[PDB]
Amino acid sequence: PSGTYAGLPIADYGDAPPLSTKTMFWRTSPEKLPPGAWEPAYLGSKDERVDGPSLQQVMRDQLKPYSEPRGLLPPQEILDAVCDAIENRLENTLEPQKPWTFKKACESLDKNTSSGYPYHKQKSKDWTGSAFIGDLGDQATHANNMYEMGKSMRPIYTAALKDELVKPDKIYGKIKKRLLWGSDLGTMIRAARAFGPFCDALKETCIFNPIRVGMSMNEDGPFIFARHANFRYHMDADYTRWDSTQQRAILKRAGDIMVRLSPEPDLARVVMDDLLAPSLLDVGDYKIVVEEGLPSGCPCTTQLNSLAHWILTLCAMVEVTRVDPDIVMQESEFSFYGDDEVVSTNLELDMVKYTMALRRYGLLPTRADKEEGPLERRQTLQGISFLRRAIVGDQFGWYGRLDRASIDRQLLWTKGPNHQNPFETLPGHRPSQLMALLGEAAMHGEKYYRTVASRVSKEAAQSGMVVPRHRSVLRWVRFGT
């Protein structure tokens, strides 16, 4: 089978299931939604909210960027210097780990997600509590034997669309739905067994290294944000379409870093060569070949993405300041979680040339006012966004607090089983979400806490606990006993 699907070459026929037409989001009250409120993303031809295209068409729209021409690679000397600097810092910080067992790799996976190719069954359906059995068991055992033998396996990725709350413009106007990459159980097991040590050792130093993957906002947030606030200037590039715009060469540098620091370097070398090779994405009708972009399906991919992000930032700064990367890195504090970043630095950075180098690398940094021009740098960390939270500070220190709009949103929407009509009210009685919302509203002051408490009392009096004092829940969420 040959041809071209969405501008990307075709490799084989598709074994993927149909795209999901259901949502996990339920309404909390049968009352009419406020105007301008957020709703679950488009659900296909069966969605009674609008008459839109097929989900296949939306997936083609989301797959178009992966065919787009790439940007320029950073200068080779700068790239080599920054990659060496990053690797040296990780050597100085990371404690060597022992290799992961097959059982540990099998127990590291979330059993509530799909197994991917070729069975597409929820992992928990073939889980015994100790190891895998049945179809998934044979898949895992074959993957493990190929891993131990140092033999290559070709990954098969499965395309999907992300169910999430989006602004109504993404439903009633230009319809958009975010693209998700699911991976196959064999590749999941191989990547786990290979890079579990590296990712775990990186998590153990979630405070000392900019790859903030695994941090706890309530516990580890304040330290990271105080370290950021030790610096004069602060910025957030807020990239648009981060994964579609990545270059496989930068990801290869990141993967080389990840391999050189792993306890089994040859096996991780084979697994990384399989991961970073031209990827086979299953869009349902065909299995197509995606040569560029980021394959965001593997469990460790976030660390990889974050590492690549790190490299790019340093390159730009080293290209702007022309000073050594280690000097930049001791005069700066970075925070990276995939596409999300916060960059704090003492260096006087020419934001014009910084944005120029970023756009030259193929990235798409955006200002907050959505106007073209160089990026903004501010002298305070207050207001910056990281991990969907806003960075705030007071006499007690820094913290991340969810914005008020998200509070109202979680009061309007609750998660549940998959259904067809997003406006159905869930009868099945959610108090943990209410307590978390109460804390997040406590971090906004007594007024908003009083409002949210009124709404929580009104919502909990139609179903199934008490409302604490503002000061008690505030101390509970801020300083946690």
Place this chain on the structure above:
Amino acid sequence: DIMVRLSPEPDLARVVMDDLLAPSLLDVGDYKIVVEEGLPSGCPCTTQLNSLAHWILTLCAMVEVTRVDPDIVMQESEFSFYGDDEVVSTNLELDMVKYTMALRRYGLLPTRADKEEGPLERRQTLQGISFLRRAIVGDQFGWYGRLDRASIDRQLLWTKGPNHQNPFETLPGHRPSQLMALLGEAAMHGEKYYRTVASRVSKEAAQSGVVPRHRSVLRWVRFG
């Protein structure tokens, strides 16, 4: 009074505090004398109490110098108190003349680092400040407290044991935990000083009862 009002049994703590802060009866061996002022540093919680007193005094001086509300000082400042030991960081333009003057007016005896009389010095870096017998240092990995080299050599020269009369007696009793702690504290000074300390510990270890790579022990003491 603050400590009592915040206690779960305030009426009992009131009596206990009134007993603690009354004129104290100190037994100097020959007589039991009455000390009406000063700090009775015998009780287990006295470290908090003294520290709390320190807090009060500091805030008072700053509020006497800046004349802004104490909460304004405290949101524009960061204090660290461990009894007599303090670190004061602030964004306020502080007249160190009036600050030291108000401190000395309260009966306190603040001293410059150069041991000369005059007003206190304020610096633009936290580097060099002392807290809990440690020096505050910072690098690309963050801030930390490092024991000075003199104290390391001192703990290499002296060990704790049972009470004796001639301090120059050598203890035959063979101290691995203290030696490992010294190794860690010496790692923070660089590979040169770490090698020196490693030579000294090895030389003093062939008379009793290994020496890790510098980077490993450095990682262990910095990031555990």
Place this chain on the structure above:
Amino acid sequence: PSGTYAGLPIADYGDAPPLSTKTMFWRTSPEKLPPGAWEPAYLGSKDERVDGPSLQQVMRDQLKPYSEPRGLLPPQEILDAVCDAIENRLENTLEPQKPWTFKKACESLDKNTSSGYPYHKQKSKDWTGSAFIGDLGDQATHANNMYEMGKSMRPIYTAALKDELVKPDKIYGKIKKRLLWGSDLGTMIRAARAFGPFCDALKETCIFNPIRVGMSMNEDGPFIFARHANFRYHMDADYTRWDSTQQRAILKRAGDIMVRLSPEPDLARVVMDDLLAPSLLDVGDYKIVVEEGLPSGCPCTTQLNSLAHWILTLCAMVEVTRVDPDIVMQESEFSFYGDDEVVSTNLELDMVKYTMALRRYGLLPTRADKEEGPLERRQTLQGISFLRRAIVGDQFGWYGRLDRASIDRQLLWTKGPNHQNPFETLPAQRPSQLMALLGEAAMHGEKYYRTVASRVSKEAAQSGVVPRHRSVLRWVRFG
């Protein structure tokens, strides 16, 4: 010719000269500038520092606020009461003066500035040391004869941009350059003859009246600051765009006060009617009509602005406290120098409603942290800023001390003739500068004095007496 320029009506064609592309600031050493240091403002299309807009565009950006709707006028009863209180205090304090001659008005002017319309010639070019001659002489004589006749003349103002040191964000980021109003020589002479006596009488009592125009920080500073420190609370609103936000009605009340206290009230009435009428500003291309704002070109404009500042402040305080303005003024001490203020008072002031009343009047008070909210009030005069000095006090008394950043700044930049490249080193002409800097650094202690003295020696080694700290300290404090 009709139309709309920068949101403001167009009246005629522009006779103004091109905007200056030069700066008076020179670097003191060829060394690299410190990061984040201040630099002369944007110099136009010829400025090699950035590729920016035309100076015409930045001037349009600065003229945009003058077309914006004004704020609300204070309550009429409050306004009348405070104006009566202010005028009565000035009557009780000011010594009556003799009218000014044409010669005195001509000799009061700064001869190093442009004559404005219609010749745009530097005053000193037609100055003999006694009177004006030539074109400027005819202009001055016509202005004087129209003054004596009680006939009106319409002033023609000339727009310009201010050469000054600005933070790099105003050059390498959003480019901004402050707007200056120059006046024409005829209006200068008329306003001088009209309000010279009043301004002189105000200068003679620069301590007892809040209009601090003419004071000397080294001589008169300590007394003013001690009387200020006699009070419990102290504040400085630190207004942004003071002149753009003014209302012509408030300026009319202030001008009525200034006229009623002048020795020639009818002629000063005519001159004020000419000054506060819709102003003709020459932006180069057109002469536009500015109906609101403050025409900041005349020699007495500083006193007028300060009087307006006084009026507005008293109005706000009386609207919040509801006590009589004279009661406020005996329970408070004000210091006004145009847009600059120091307010000391014993009244418990609700800063929320105070800031609310200020913003209702069109003013733009700003916090030190640049955050929105009510104004901050402190219990000590230390730290307050007045005339670019910080107010400090010690066992010897109060004084005004130049900030440390300003010291480093004057160490980096020196004034000289106008040139195009701000980083050219000036080859000397700074003898009276380094010693003053030495004194201002002496007021910071022996450490900062030692650092500044090292820098002064290392720079003076390019040109060729560094006293003891204590001696120069005595000289600047107690002379």
